Amino acid sequence: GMEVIESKWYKKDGASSASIDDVEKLLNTTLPKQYKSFLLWSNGGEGKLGDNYIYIWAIEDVIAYNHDYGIQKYLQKEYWAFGMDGDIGYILHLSDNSIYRVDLGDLDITSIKYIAPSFDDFLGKAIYLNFNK
């Protein structure tokens, strides 16, 4: 029968122009358009989208988290973590916008799990698909 499904987002203020420019300058490349669009709305935040707890980092913190978790080191330079759910990291590819899940405690290029072709697609899937399976 009918079931009430929720997606809740605890929205932060949006990212400033300077904050986005700073990270693009440091990366020496562009952020994926949809990820940037989300950040301009909510600069990080956290929520429960369907069954999925997702914690997204403020753009000012992304470089430091990526260094701490060793993302580029174990993956390659195109892959950047943007959030997490405990052991699980959420990663994007800077060029093709694809989204993956990884075990932050066992990072391996061969084991990254593709979940969506882009950021907005990810957000939409989340309402009806449990990424923990």
Added chain:
Amino acid sequence: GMEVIESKWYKKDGASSASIDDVEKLLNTTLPKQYKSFLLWSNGGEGKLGDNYIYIWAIEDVIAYNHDYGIQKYLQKEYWAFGMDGDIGYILHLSDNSIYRVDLGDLDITSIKYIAPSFDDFLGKAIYLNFNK
């Protein structure tokens, strides 16, 4: 500062695969994969995703609704409505999976408005973009 954004989907029982196949047979075409995946989860339903009220049709009703609103008559055979919000129709393009908005009361190929490249992308956008702009 922080703001609680919700969304809710009033989920129906999933569509039978057979019921989806019946429509594909009748249309002599394949439906977009993401749309089918959503139907398998919820065979229509309605919700408020961000600021957006969205009412999605059960698969068994889609052909009759498309006929009644004259979607193919006014648009093209490649465009199929899957839902609405009052005057607004939500349409998919069979050839490339994209999602559009139209005014059901003023259907015209020249005035269809692109909103997303796929169904899941559309759902994700809805959480943070108000399509009534």
